[PDB]
Design a protein around this ligand. Structure first.
Ligand SMILES: N[C@H](CCC(=O)O)C(=O)O
Ligand SMILES: N[C@H](CCC(=O)O)C(=O)O
Lengths: 227, 227
């Protein structure tokens, strides 16, 4: 049977929620044995991703990701890293250790190609600094970058609210305002933590916003994506 | 740092919820790196636990648990199996592979010793058949066994409602009735799936019921229990 390996904990809250999603969106028909087999390394003690860029110690972090990928390659058929900013370590990893990997950037890029309207990239300043989406996406011109002012306002929301486990709906008003400002009905979860907002939005049947959320897509299309 | 290993998927829904609990009850103060490091093997394709007792094939199931314990012993400092009925395989496992293990039966037994009033054991017929709680607990006389009629009614709730992911509150009325019938204000989660009820109960501030729920206890007392 096919096994997804999640290198998570770079949002312990969101890693927990991601696994909930996997079974929410793949309910069994008769028996539980039908349902997805998953492995989760939820290690919060990964060095802070943006903070490791802001100080000198990017090597400490790349070493973390590399070691845990070697583990997961032995155990899982496909692999996902539970953090967009964490993808910056990938150019420094051996190509062989990334055969099973599923880039959250690539999953967003595909979704955005099909959606085909301008969309607001919500992400941590460290994701922005590394330009992971602008450098990684075929659809990079459809991405609307936040101004530096608003990148910090988003960094606030992620760390102060979402990662702490507070009600994702609490920032909904602030996001609707941003979507209005930059003049769009859609956003990209350029910070996996916005998986928590996407779920809260879908719960209340709020259809006005189109979320391009890689974790939601990986969950929903598990059966197709995992071989 | 200390690592909990969860052999889960014997309730994929509840395994997902258990990991959510771990971070709900251990929120970080300053930084995420503080938060618990956890590994989860959520493998629903474990043979049905009660069904493996009801047919001949208990060896197929014990082999499953044994293989995955060998894996987890190499990776985690403490280990938890996410299913009470699954604990029946333990007498057939080597003693060495169970040093790191934390019996859900033992955790319930301790909690019940401190609570010290009669308490209704809610569990699958397969747990009951194997007498895991009556044979495993120092406090076995404080346990109130369900009648065979009500064991099937509980088996219904677990498989039809809880494992499918339906609102645990939907069975609250049926449980209050059972608690009244057997004349007690408390229950034991003899089926890890009742972790889902305990959480839903705590959410609505329903204090009338005292839940002895091993997963909730392991979550809340993570820092103390994991070395
Ligand atoms: N969560 C990462 C950024 C912060 C982190 O590494 O946890 C993301 O947006 O994908
Ligand atoms: N969930 C198990 C019983 C059914 C199962 O193995 O999933 C428990 O009550 O601990």
């Amino acid at each position: 049977l096919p096994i997804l390996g999640v290198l998570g904990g770079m949002g312990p809250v969101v890693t927990a929620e991601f696994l909930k999603s996997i079974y929410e969106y793949n309910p069994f028909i008769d028996k539980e044995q039908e349902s997805p087999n998953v492995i989760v390394f939820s290690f919060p003690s990964a060095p802070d991703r943006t903070g490791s860029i802001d100080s000198g110690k990017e090597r400490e972090f790349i070493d973390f990701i590399q070691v845990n990928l070697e583990h997961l390659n032995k155990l899982a058929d496909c692999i996902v890293i539970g953090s967009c900013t964490a993808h910056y370590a990938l150019p420094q990893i051996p190509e062989n250790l990334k055969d099973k990997l599923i880039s959250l950037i690539k999953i967003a890029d595909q979704e955005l190609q099909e959606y085909n309207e301008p969309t607001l990239l919500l992400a941590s300043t460290g994701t922005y600094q590394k330009k992971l989406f602008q450098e990684g996406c075929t659809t990079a011109d459809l991405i609307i970058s936040l101004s530096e002012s608003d990148q910090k306002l988003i960094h606030e929301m992620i760390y102060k609210v979402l990662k702490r486990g507070h009600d994702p709906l609490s920032i909904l008003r602030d996001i609707e305002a941003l979507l209005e400002k930059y003049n769009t009905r859609s956003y990209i979860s350029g910070s996996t933590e916005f998986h928590l907002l996407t779920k809260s939005l879908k719960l209340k049947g709020i259809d006005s916003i189109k979320a391009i959320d890689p974790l939601s897509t990986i969950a929903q299309n598990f059966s197709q994506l995992i071989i």
